[PDB]
Amino acid sequence: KRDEALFELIALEEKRQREGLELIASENFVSKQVREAVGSVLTNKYAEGYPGARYYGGCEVIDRVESLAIERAKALFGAAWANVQPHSGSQANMAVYMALMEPGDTLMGMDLAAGGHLTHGSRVNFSGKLYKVVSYGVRPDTELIDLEEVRRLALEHRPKVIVAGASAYPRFWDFKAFREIADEVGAYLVVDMAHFAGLVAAGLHPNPLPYAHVVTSTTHKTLRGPRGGLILSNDPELGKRIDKLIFPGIQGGPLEHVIAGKAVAFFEALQPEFKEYSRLVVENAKRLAEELARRGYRIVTGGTDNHLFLVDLRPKGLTGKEAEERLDAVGITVNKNAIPFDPKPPRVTSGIRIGTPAITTRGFTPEEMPLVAELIDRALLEGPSEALREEVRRLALAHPMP
Amino acid sequence: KRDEALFELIALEEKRQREGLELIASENFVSKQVREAVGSVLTNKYAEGYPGARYYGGCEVIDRVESLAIERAKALFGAAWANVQPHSGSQANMAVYMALMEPGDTLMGMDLAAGGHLTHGSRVNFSGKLYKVVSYGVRPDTELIDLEEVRRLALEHRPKVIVAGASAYPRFWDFKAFREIADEVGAYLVVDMAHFAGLVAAGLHPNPLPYAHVVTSTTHKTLRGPRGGLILSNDPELGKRIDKLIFPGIQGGPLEHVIAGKAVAFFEALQPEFKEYSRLVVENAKRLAEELARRGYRIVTGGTDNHLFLVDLRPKGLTGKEAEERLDAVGITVNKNAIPFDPKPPRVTSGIRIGTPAITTRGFTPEEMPLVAELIDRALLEGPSEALREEVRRLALAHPMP
């Protein structure tokens, strides 16, 4: 018997995605071929271990699939080693921390309120539970990272691992300087490029590979692949230690169907069209932030160098939670986000985060940003309304989905 | 541009699956509708948090999907609470350990050599790195667990957590006895039913829900669902604590496409046909074990109560490693497994584990077990040959995949 109830819900979700403007910076729309691989029979095989070194037999074809994903990842990012088995970005980070540190050691990452991710040292996350955390933020004036403040914190606290990269920082990272700082205290530099991995692949964002000891990432987000994790390094000796932490360290069997999807995603990222897409992603982000600033909205750091930006809603008397709800009411999805030196608690926040990778995949161009900017503005000032919801629907439907 | 290289490999793997006999106890073949859900657009949504309490907008449909999976899991197993977000079995156990123990605490599980799982205390696994481990095994004379030995160890080491459940134990578990032991020392009883979950759902195996404080499992294996984890309990308060460990504790965004697949698998398991399937799984295992005993092999414990059984190859002078290779050469996959107090090292062993869930899914019935037994025996005695490989191939092809 077919589970009609469940499939009816899947159809409702397709409709929602098609009829709205998805502006959550961490989302995107995978291609049909990525889905074809993820929904393949590769899920019926237990492949504990690594290619050529599996626990069980019958992995001759799976080994070629995994190997292909590994080599393409290496080729795509210019890395000497890769591990494509992490179930997620969080497991990728977990593995790296456990390979380089012992519980109790000191970890240094970006403060959550300044843009850091939960896995960069939050007390409610494994990172802040097993390790002593020291965070760095951004300057109160420019809202940019001050490298001398980072240097100071490193010398004072002597972290074993320093993490660069974030989930809500809209400017470029100076990886060379972060490596110099880590070298000053004998720490490992770990770059979590999950958010900008696609831009790095397209050559539109500095590559951390040569400067970081280890690089982690998600395969979804700007890389536009399936949901999963990835770990890279220019040092294969360090890589061997990390492989051991992924399995048998923290995971059991890998999701080989997902890994097949990663291989397809890397193949897609290697095509010239991916660079054109990535360029448009950034152009859309700059133009959209610009149009919102023209309407009186304050953009953190005054703009963006990547695919995302933050809007400070304090001057407008709106909390991030309220903005998110008013936009969601009309089909525009974003997520409330804390801003630097946010006076309000994380459950409420004073701003919203916006990203363009998803709408750019749907074919939106910089010339359409002024229109998107107008819908956001009205939803926030005039609030939800049927006429507004319809205008959003029509705009969305005029753009296809992969 | 289609990734022809990758898709050519997917076709080869399908051909491999069709033409061979999969006897690895942890394997199974999922239905078309389970793959359809896993390959759905639900992968495009970030949905951190839980139903009604997410960190992003646009989760209205996803909430109905996850709630559906939760409620079906509760009805299927007779539970008061459930968490369907774990990426795997390993993450389900990790979350439970971290919610119940602090690093340094003592964990008690079944010895890996006796049938326990990597996550039950192995030194190369996170369980053995973060916690002090005490292991229990089987008696050389009975080949079964000795509850008095378990009790003794418990009183002597005072573990914070006692894990029941294994990956290679062919008999029923006395959950009531285990809980009595746990109460006596003030420990939590955690049951990992990953392997036998499908049997529990079909009511063919004692249900651990009423006796354990927490129950973990995989959604694949005898439950025949997609690859992933699951947590259940009869205590909602404890459940709320475990929800926090899954997120924001150890994971980030859940795989909602996989959770949709879990919902479908639970739907399939709630149908009367699943009970007939599971009845056949157990009958095939008992019958195949009998047929092999009749042909000169010894069955550990003399038989089985579930879907798997251990073969002692000593009567025929073979090691598990050799048996594994000889079988693999003719398209029959099994895995080597130590027998109680194996005289051979662990990388060699004197036995093999055989499980019937996968062939049963393909339509094999008890009357055909004698034929599978003969093919296994001929491959081990005569060794691989083209003629034998063709006989396996034809038998396999005559039993379609889902």
Author numbering:
A (entry chain B): 1006 to 1407
B (entry chain A): 6 to 407
Publication text:
Serine hydroxymethyltransferase (SHMT), a ubiquitous PLP-dependent enzyme in the aminotransferase superfamily, catalyzes the reversible conversion of L-serine (L-Ser) to glycine (Gly), transferring a one-carbon unit to tetrahydrofolate (THF) to yield 5,10-methylenetetrahydrofolate (5,10-MTHF). As an enzyme in one-carbon metabolism, SHMT is essential to the synthesis of thymine nucleotides, purines, methionine, and other essential biomolecules. SHMT is found as a homodimer in prokaryotes, such as Thermus thermophilus (Tth), and a homotetramer in eukaryotes, such as humans.
To track an amino acid substrate within the SHMT active site cavity, we obtained a second joint XN structure by soaking the same TthSHMT crystal with deuterated L-Ser (L-Ser-d7). This structure revealed L-Ser-d7 bound in a solvent-exposed peripheral substrate binding site at the entrance to the active site cavity in an apparent pre-Michaelis complex, with the sulfate anion continuing to block the L-Ser-d7 entry deeper into the active site cavity. Although it was expected that L-Ser-d7 would displace Lys226 in the Schiff base linkage to PLP to form the external aldimine, the intact internal aldimine was observed in this structure with the sulfate ions still occupying the substrate binding sites in both protomers. In protomer A of TthSHMT/L-Ser, L-Ser-d7 is observed in the zwitterionic state with the protonated α-amino group facing a hydrophobic patch made up of Leu117 (Leu166 in hSHMT2), Leu123 (Leu172 in hSHMT2), and Phe252* (Phe320* in hSHMT2), whereas the deprotonated carboxyl group is directed into the bulk solvent. The hydroxyl group of L-Ser-d7 donates its D atom in a weak bifurcated H-bond with a water molecule (2.20 Å), mediating its contact with Glu53*, and the sulfate ion (2.6 Å). The hydroxyl group of Tyr61* (Tyr106* in hSHMT2) rotates away from the sulfate ion to lose its H-bond as found in the substrate-free TthSHMT structure, and now makes a 2.2 Å H-bond with the L-Ser hydroxyl oxygen. It is important to note that in the TthSHMT/L-Ser joint XN structure, we found the same protonation states in the active sites of both protomers that were observed in the substrate-free structure. Thus, the non-covalent binding of the substrate in the pre-Michaelis complex does not disturb the locations of H atoms and hence the electrostatics of the active site cavity.
